[PDB]
Design a binder for this molecule. Structure first.
Ligand SMILES: OC[C@H]1O[C@H](O[C@H]2[C@@H](O)[C@H](O)[C@@H](CO)O[C@@H]2O)[C@@H](O)[C@@H](O)[C@@H]1O
Lengths: 218, 212
């Protein structure tokens, strides 16, 4: 089957540069107009740029005009998106998509897409999280607050994986400071609060930080 | 051209007939496509030229309309159809998309279980206090969390995060975090989270007094 692979995603400082690439499997790009699309955190789609066959026409969205450059290499079957003067608002999943149909016409839909690459534009630097307990007051709850870290992601386990039932790790929230924050919670019986031990295990691979935090009533 | 999709969220059960509308700001003839997308996955083309079904797509998917009004109908929704659907106006060298419609699994109304968490003494030394409110295993997704500090309503100092619909029980969980400076936190005594949801006949307020 036809496959498209985006690469080159990652972290960029606000005002920096990054080049995305899109490669393929089981087809040649030469007869296809190729496009870049991005999924904004909402999560709708936004057309970014298009490059026609032979690089004759290059069209860009108003939000990216003059800052983004689309290019293609038909011999090797690669499409590029060179991004300059990157803004925090360029943070998104970027997809490469082929314009096509069973029989090629002057105006076809996007018949094949890649799975996307995450692009995160931020003035922040690698920062390990602070790990605070969420202490309990029939059924009770306890947790861990994982705050002021960068970049995403962070892993959270309870009692080294022994406690999985009733576990909820929330999606991270972007704070005004440009650092992420997340909570992980577990529902447990009120009677077990003084008897059972509850330990949250936090892992942040980018800063090589592993934290074990015991959660007890205050 | 501006594409507007309605509704933004659609609740449904297996076997239901559902409809998604796309309205264009100006006439686009039949230059419209519909895509399906699952979280963290590539979009998939379903229908193009407003009503042509892509080869391989199940016949329960149908597209209709022209000019400024378009509809995507799923006749007999199947388990694999719970996803986000996007409409697109496509031209020779550009395209525009609607905002997307998420189709979610319908289940019986379930009230949230509510818990409040005070900030830790350890956090106060950092100069900030985070008060957390947890709303556990509820349905539908709509819920209102109101923060009260000394019986006064808070605004703009809280952020919410919601889990994806649970694969086992089709419920949602939500965390609401109220962030205050150490000075503002220590200035007040009673901290409360007041929750309202369809599953409740009375509002649920969880509270604590700083310093117990
Ligand atoms: O973007 C327009 C068009 O570009 C590509 O097709 C080109 C060419 O390869 C085709 O043979 C002719 C046939 O009409 O059209 C273009 O010149 C494809 O990307 C096509 O899907 C797209 O609509």
């Amino acid at each position: 089957e036809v496959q498209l692979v985006e690469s080159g995603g990652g972290l960029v400082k606000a005002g920096g540069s990054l080049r995305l690439s899109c490669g393929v499997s089981n087809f040649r790009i030469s007869a296809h107009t190729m496009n870049w699309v991005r999924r904004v955190p909402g999560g709708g789609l936004e057309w970014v740029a298009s490059i026609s066959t032979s690089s004759t026409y290059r069209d860009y969205a108003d939000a990216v005009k003059g800052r983004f450059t689309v290019s293609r290499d038909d011999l090797e079957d690669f499409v590029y998106l060179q991004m300059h003067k990157m803004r925090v608002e360029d943070t998104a999943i970027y997809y490469c998509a082929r314009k096509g149909s069973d029989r090629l016409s002057d105006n076809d839909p996007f018949d094949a897409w890649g799975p996307g690459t995450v692009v995160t534009v931020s003035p922040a630097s690698t920062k390990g999280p602070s790990v605070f307990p969420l202490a309990p007051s029939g059924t009770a709850a306890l947790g861990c607050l994982v705050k002021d870290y960068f970049p995403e992601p962070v892993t959270v386990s309870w009692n080294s994986g022994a406690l999985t039932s009733g576990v909820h790790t929330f999606p991270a929230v972007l704070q005004s400071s440009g650092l992420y924050s997340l909570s992980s919670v577990v529902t447990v019986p009120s009677s077990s609060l003084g008897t059972q031990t509850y330990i949250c295990n936090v892992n942040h691979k980018p800063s090589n930080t592993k934290v074990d935090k015991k959660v007890e009533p205050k | 051209v501006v594409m507007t999709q309605s509704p933004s969220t659609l609740s449904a059960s297996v076997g239901d007939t559902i409809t998604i509308t796309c309205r264009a700001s100006q006439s686009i003839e039949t230059w419209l496509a519909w895509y399906q997308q699952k979280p963290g996955k590539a979009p998939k083309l379903l229908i193009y030229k407003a009503s042509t079904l892509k080869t391989g797509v199940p016949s329960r998917f149908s597209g209709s309309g022209s000019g400024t009004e378009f509809t995507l109908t799923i006749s007999g929704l199947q388990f694999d159809d719970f996803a986000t659907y996007h409409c697109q106006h496509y031209a020779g060298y550009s395209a525009t998309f609607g905002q997307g419609t998420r189709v979610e699994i319908k289940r019986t109304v379930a009230a949230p279980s509510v818990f409040i968490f005070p900030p830790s003494d350890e956090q106060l030394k950092s100069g900030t206090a985070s008060v957390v409110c947890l709303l556990n295993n509820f349905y539908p997704r709509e819920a209102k969390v109101q923060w009260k500090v000394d019986n006064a309503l808070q605004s703009g100092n809280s952020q919410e995060s919601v889990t994806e619909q649970d694969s086992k029980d089709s419920t949602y969980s939500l965390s609401s975090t109220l962030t205050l400076s150490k000075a503002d936190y220590e200035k007040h005594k009673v901290y409360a989270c007041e929750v309202t949801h369809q599953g409740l006949s009375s509002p649920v307020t969880k509270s604590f007094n700083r310093g117990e």
